[PDB]
Design a protein around this ligand. Structure first.
Ligand SMILES: O=C(NCCOC(=O)[C@@H]1CCCCN1S(=O)(=O)Cc1ccccc1)c1cccnc1
Ligand SMILES: [Ca+2]
Length: 189
């Protein structure tokens, strides 16, 4: 009928929007940006690999129900896979001091399963998280993945289970053999 359901993915989670096919996608982009506490200028929305302009409507773009829009936060994106199998991507490259093994770094983070279900966030507690980098106090993917970040940076870590909670998983919310996705913002080193 008159309306269309669109999925918007940012590489970490996915949420749906229902809008009129004749409504300009600006409102969707605004609702997505305001939800993630981000400025509209800082986001790029892509459909069929082509960047969406806010004046364009789903009808203009011949969108179908349950089509996917990608929201990107970075400058060409680069996903690095290290020798351990850890994957990381700098969404924002910081410009302050560099985090190295042995330093106590303070961060905000959100963690999701690879299906998009959030399992924890320091932002939910309104409380930054600090740890000794390389100190064996966090999962291996974090001791490796946070090194090299600079203050002000946001880095997305994709952690295979052997660098996370392994075959066992953790508690009630981390399943066995789970790959973990974290977005980590370095606040202080
Ligand atoms: O959990 C804490 N310390 C244990 C070590 O944690 C970790 O190595 C990873 C990576 C570093 C940040 C947190 N986590 S996590 O994957 O989000 C843990 C988790 C799993 C399932 C549900 C909720 C939370 C902890 C202590 C003090 C304040 N805040 C968190
Ligand atoms: Ca704290």
């Amino acid at each position: 009928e008159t309306h269309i359901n669109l999925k918007v993915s940012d590489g970490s989670s996915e949420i749906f929007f229902k809008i009129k096919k004749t409504t300009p996608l600006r409102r969707l982009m605004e609702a997505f940006a305001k939800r993630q506490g981000k400025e509209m200028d800082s986001l790029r929305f892509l459909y069929d690999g082509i960047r969406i302009q806010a004046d364009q409507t789903p009808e203009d773009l011949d969108m179908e129900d349950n089509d996917i829009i990608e929201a990107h936060r970075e400058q060409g994106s680069t996903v690095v896979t290290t020798e351990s199998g850890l994957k990381y991507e700098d969404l924002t490259e910081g410009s302050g001091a560099e985090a190295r093994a042995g330093q106590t770094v303070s961060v905000h983070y959100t963690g999701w399963l690879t299906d998009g279900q959030k399992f924890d966030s320091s932002k939910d507690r309104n409380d930054p998280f600090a740890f000794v980098l390389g100190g064996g106090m966090v999962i291996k993917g974090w001791d490796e993945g946070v090194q090299g970040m600079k203050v002000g940076g946001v880095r997305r870590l994709t952690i295979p289970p052997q660098l996370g909670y392994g075959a066992r998983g953790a508690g009630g919310v981390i399943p066995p053999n789970a790959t973990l996705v974290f977005e980590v913002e370095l606040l202080d080193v």
